[PDB]
Write a protein that binds this ligand. Structure first.
Ligand SMILES: CC(C)(COP(=O)(O)OP(=O)(O)OC[C@H]1O[C@@H](n2cnc3c(N)ncnc32)[C@H](O)[C@@H]1OP(=O)(O)O)[C@H](O)C(=O)NCCC(=O)NCCS
Ligand SMILES: CC(C)(COP(=O)(O)OP(=O)(O)OC[C@H]1O[C@@H](n2cnc3c(N)ncnc32)[C@H](O)[C@@H]1OP(=O)(O)O)[C@H](O)C(=O)NCCC(=O)NCCS
Ligand SMILES: NC(=[NH2+])NCCC[C@H](N)C(=O)O
Ligand SMILES: NC(=[NH2+])NCCC[C@H](N)C(=O)O
Ligand SMILES: NC(=[NH2+])NCCC[C@H](N)C(=O)O
Lengths: 424, 128, 280, 424
């Protein structure tokens, strides 16, 4: 599409993201090749758009390759890694190397053609960890879990504009270092600072369904369903995402960190690429307020509409319902009522062309017939000059003016008059 | 072109505009039609992107079209318009009308599909 | 009396007024003659004594004269004005003209003999309004009422030392402008920002009793008594003052804005001139 | 001892005192001789270590000498001074003179060899007082008591780094001056600003017991006992200290202001010189938290200890108890439990050499047998390679491995196994 159309779509998200906190759990494997440089440049930009960023890399694959390559086969015990002294030792080394590598990439990356300020990056002793102990008789050795998180230190770094870099390691009150699990520590950190977004950067497009199709959006309930029989790797992710959502994180997003611009497509478009997960179903229908009038107006302009001088939209806003998807108001409908108690009218049913042919209209029709049935009303009318076929295909029969409520018949003196009988 | 190519070219300038001052002188003819709405909406957007905005509108066309309609002929000297009592009167009036017109468009407009904060506008005895 | 005796009486009120918020509903008619310049100079002084000032002019008389003068007789419907498109249109014009006129008077006024700093004055989009709709079958058209008030923007302007200027107009979420009733919008704004004083500047000494005597002080209960049988203009005032008092405004004061120094006599002496009204 | 050993002991108190508020009630008699200069120099230092200081002098002795010396014998009425117009008059004079004298001493004192900034000192109208009135028929005349205290003005002076100087005088709403009692006004001021310390600088070492021995630490309850039959001067002190403690002051300390460095020994060592008083007994036993692990670790290092890789200290912290004296963690002990419900083990009993041979171990043993009895458990074991004699002297008999719980016998395959039977 045109530049303008894309900017109209990105700009609101820039308004929204700025000041927001985002926790990124990055796969260790992404921090090496051409991808590292790509990530760093994009992460740089986000920083420059004022997003508050906390980054946490993983290390299990590197620790797993490194162990195999030197004779010791790695043990997982009900899902978590056993980490012996040697591995711990290598884990500290790896964090060092990946840290350097990232600073260099950050330092030597560019954002566009003009000269930008450099991008500040910081680490410190934010995580105090504790040993998991023993599971099923097995000693987990230096495998650890977050005990305490210096949230105030983090917020302080973040308010100053710094990117925060955390390795999957923590110290303990007993004076030792422990290996953390990144997927989980990122979830835990995100819950701790009430982050608006938890992002997992993976080597996969996001969560696929059993049939291959990329998921795209999931409620927590649907996410747990998917997890029943899936790879322990996708299982760990979902277990952690749901826990984050449960703790207050607004959204957890899963993408492919090795796909060019992934991060920018996910965060600044309405569809994203990858998988978005939320506590509750995306799509809700709520009662309108004065605040929605401009969205409803804009949802009506594209028409078929009275609405010039003053409004009925103003003083009867309360009888409108709006459909939202993921915070976007895509549709609305109103129920009008009468001196006759068994009558009502669906008015202003509108879904923006942008979100159209996706089931929203019908969801709005279902919602308002429920509202109408909830208050008696057994006959619901729709009068429309062009949208008759839609209602006609959806249980409305043509009706004569002689069936209208008094006031409505008066008004109608002029297009298709349709009704549908409801079940009380 | 693709979204990412477009975002990539746009993002640097967002970074640069945030905290920048932009003085706009706006032709008075621009503050009436569907152009008002389309305009108000985007000034609205600029403002949400942290740009510092100072809008100044013109009037000469309004005043000249108001003259023709009532028999008077506008006199310009060295680019600037001669301004009688009556004209000054009409300008204070025009300012009223356009300041309201613009506030209403602003309040009635939208950045996107999500609900957003309203956009504050301010006026004052800044110019002596 | 002596200078000292007067200063002993004024000084405490200066201690008290500073930092205080005062909402002035000013009659449109006052914003033209010699009076405008007087008002502006006195309003200037108050600003300079650190009183936080929110000013709101009226316009019904100007809209009423203007309509009559061009054939259309103005309709009031149970007390509030019907405002058609044309009137709305003229209302926007009037606010423009009265705004300019006030800045000029403010700019060219003086406070005494020594040189003072200039006085900062500000307006913005603080009031979002909504249509009243239909009353008794009549369409009120562009007549409107406050829906939402940007209290935080106001406090911000006021904490910075600015005088705030509001016209009796508001915008709506539906993208249109509405005519407000000043007496009421001033009451509403005052309730919104918990103002210590709501002052109505009128062409009258304040509220007179049925026998002519200026009232002077009224409790709300006594004020409502007076309103039973009185002019709809004095009725509107009292209806709005009582609502302000009910919402938390400490005092509502009614004076003659066309009387020299009125404002200064009301605010800085114990008796005042004019009518003071309190909840109890 | 060495410099280092002394600095290890002082430094923590410097961390703690800074930002703290201390109210000093100073005896009038101290504000003249060589002592004045000593006090001023030491008070200067405290100020320079960032302690927030409010100073209040007394005057009864000077008013009492001055009266006698001119024919009028001073009347006390149930303990408080009657202050007539003349005395009041002299009291105002005295405050003037003592104020000057103190500024001069402060100005001309030194802190060490290098050049320091000068020390800011401030007074103002913080205390509004009221007349006591009449007691037992006697008119107390200008004797007064605090009515109202400008706490916000005080905090303001103190946050700016100023030493605050208050005389034992206050003004009244009725426009007169009143004589305050210093011991009491200092207590009252301290309660008002929730001061961490109320310090009485006296001509005595602190509160002595009926047998001469300096007290040292007292709970309020013990302090009131001492007061039953003691000098009205030591009675006034205690009455006021207890009231302070009751109102929230953390500690009230009583020293000899005429003893060189007293103030510095009291505030920066664990024992002090002088008498410390607290609301409750010094010495308490509480349940451990993750926060105490490092203190317990340091309490264990000096040994006799597993504890290298990960810990049991980490995940079973909850079963540890720690003994503290006056905020210092000096000991700990754990109760270990078993699949067998009648068994338990005291483990990790440790009291630092610093506080040792003072009854703490035994207090910890008593505490854990109570915990153990509280949950059944009739046999408590101790296995120890060197500390056997201590437990053997304290009701533990040697036991054979065949008496151990299963898991414990397994582990023990090796030192002295002792048990003590408990009373359910
Ligand atoms: C009527 C409307 C709001 C329903 O929206 P929706 O979100 O697309 O609803 P659904 O997705 O549940 O319905 C989609 C189907 O309706 C069809 N449809 C759209 N307009 C139609 C019409 N005028 N007549 C018949 N069918 C229509 C779409 O082609 C699609 O067909 P399909 O499911 O076989 O692919 C519709 O989106 C629309 O075009 N609204 C335009 C403005 C308007 O309706 N104004 C006033 C209405 S009272
Ligand atoms: C055992 C211990 C903790 C008790 O501490 P405590 O605070 O001194 O306890 P108390 O003051 O109640 O007991 C003091 C008496 O115990 C004595 N004592 C110290 N160690 C002793 C030992 N190994 N055997 C016998 N008596 C001992 C002291 O000499 C003192 O004797 P006394 O009262 O006749 O003067 C002791 O302080 C200690 O030395 N602990 C060292 C480390 C340790 O105990 N590790 C593991 C223990 S399971
Ligand atoms: N996979 C998706 N459905 N993504 C939607 C993303 C929406 C929005 N831009 C966000 O970052 O939250
Ligand atoms: N009309 C009156 N009685 N006025 C009394 C005013 C008292 C005081 N100066 C004030 O401004 O509130
Ligand atoms: N007399 C005592 N026991 N004093 C103990 C003082 C402890 C500590 N240094 C304090 O100032 O509070």
């Amino acid at each position: 599409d045109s530049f303008v159309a894309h900017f109209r779509e990105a700009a609101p998200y820039i308004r929204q993201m700025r000041g927001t906190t985002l926790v990124a759990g990055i796969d260790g494997r992404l921090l090496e090749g051409g991808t590292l440089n790509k990530l760093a440049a994009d992460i740089g930009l986000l920083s420059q758009l004022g997003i508050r960023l906390v980054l946490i890399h993983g290390a299990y694959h590197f620790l797993d390759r490194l162990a195999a390559a030197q004779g010791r086969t790695p043990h997982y015990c009900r899902g978590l890694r056993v980490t012996d002294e040697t591995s711990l030792g290598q884990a500290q080394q790896f964090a060092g190397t990946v840290r350097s590598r990232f600073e260099a990439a950050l330092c030597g990356s560019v954002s566009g053609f003009a000269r930008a300020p450099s991008v500040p990056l910081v680490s410190g002793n934010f995580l105090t960890a504790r040993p998991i102990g023993v599971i099923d008789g097995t000693d987990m050795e230096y495998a650890g879990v977050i005990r305490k998180t210096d949230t105030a230190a983090l917020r302080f770094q973040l308010d100053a504009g710094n990117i925060v870099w955390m390795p999957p390691l923590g110290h303990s009150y007993g004076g030792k270092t422990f290996n953390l699990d990144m997927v989980q520590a990122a979830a835990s950190v995100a819950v701790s600072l009430q982050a608006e977004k938890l992002v997992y950067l993976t080597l996969s497009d996001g969560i696929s369904r059993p049939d291959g199709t990329l998921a795209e959006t999931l409620s927590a309930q649907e996410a747990q369903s998917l997890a029943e029989h899936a790879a322990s790797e996708t299982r760990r992710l979902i277990s952690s995402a749901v826990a984050a959502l449960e703790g207050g994180v607004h959204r957890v997003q899963i993408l492919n960190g090795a796909a060019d611009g992934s991060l920018l497509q996910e965060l600044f478009t309405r569809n994203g690429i990858g998988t978005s997960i939320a506590k509750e179903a995306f799509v809700s229908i709520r009662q309108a307020h004065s605040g929605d009038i401009p969205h409803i107006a804009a949802l009506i302009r594209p028409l078929i509409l009275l609405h010039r001088s003053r409004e009925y939209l103003e003083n009867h806003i309360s009888e409108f319902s709006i459909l939202e998807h993921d915070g976007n108001l895509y549709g609305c409908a109103a129920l009008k009522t009468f001196a006759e108690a068994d009558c009502g009218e669906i008015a202003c049913l509108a879904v923006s062309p942008q979100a159209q042919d996706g089931g929203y209209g019908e969801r709005l029709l279902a919602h308002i017939i429920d509202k109408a049935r909830g208050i008696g009303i057994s006959r619901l009318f729709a009068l429309s000059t062009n949208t008759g076929e839609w209602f006609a295909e959806r249980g409305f029969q043509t009706a004569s003016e002689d069936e209208l409520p008094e006031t409505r018949r008066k008004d109608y003196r002029n297009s298709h008059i349709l009704v549908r009988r409801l079940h009380r």
